């Protein structure tokens, strides 16, 4: 009997040595099987597959535990959806722009590129090891896996239209933000002392205005005390002037012909508009901004 040695895994951390009969398909021996995102279930082993690592679906307690510990989800479809996305994201190009990893436009990924750029400029501790590992690989230039995971965790497929604010929110909900806090106080002369506190993910997000200067000053009138490493402000896309040094980064959204497109503006020594692979540098920027991110120092 002709056989080769392969490795199976669900996390690419614990590798399980397996002997495969080249006469049988991977699906008959392991079940649904993947190589770098490609479904090889109906494929028989090639000699080139010797010593390669293959993803399989967790069909036993050992693989289930390893999967849950690594991904922090029980969704049985997660790994399949992750692999399906990876087979595309691995083919995307990831150019370095101004020291930041970006994505060349493909499969309507402007929102992912903009999120990827933003994530590199804020300090975030993910709870799932899968995200934390891919996060640091993405910051180093290898972001194909991180992008595939974002798609999987957000229940979005390659090519699906997406929203940066949504994507950031759902990723924040897989992060440790327990120390973040936003204390709100009612501004009144007759109501006395009225305060409520938002803790966790709610404290790092706000919808309604883009300016932190205004948000801090007011809103009935509410005084705000913000204690978070970062804050994301979102508002309907409208013409908005981005002044250098007054923000960290921002998302621009254009809706020409109801076909959306995102660009990323970051504030470095000057303003940089990163549109996928494209880069435009300006001292001033006016555009239809919809998200602005601010960092604590
Ligand atoms: C015309 O786009 N309007 C948008 C929008 C509308 C109301 C908002 C109200 C807000 O606070 C009250 C805060 C943000 C808001 C944003 C987003 C802009 C970004 C792109 N999205 C698209 C929707 C599907 C794909 C992406 C749509």
Numbering used by the authors: 2 to 220, 231 to 308
Study text:
The replacement of the central ketone group with an oxime led to WEHI-P2, with a submicromolar IC50 and with micromolar cellular activity in a FRET assay and was further elaborated to introduce a cyclohexanol group to generate WEHI-P3. Moreover, co-crystals with WEHI-P2 in the same space group failed to explain the significantly improved IC50 achieved through oxime incorporation; the oxime group, installed to engage the BL2 groove, did not form protein contacts and was poorly defined by electron density.
In addition to Mpro, coronaviruses encode an essential papain-like protease (PLpro) within non-structural protein 3 (nsp-3). In this study, we describe a novel chemical scaffold that targets the essential coronavirus protease PLpro, with low nanomolar activity against SARS-CoV-2 PLpro and other pathogenic coronaviruses. Our structures collectively reveal how WEHI-P series compounds achieve their high potency through exploiting an unexpected PLpro binding site, expanding PLpro drug discovery to a new chemical scaffold.
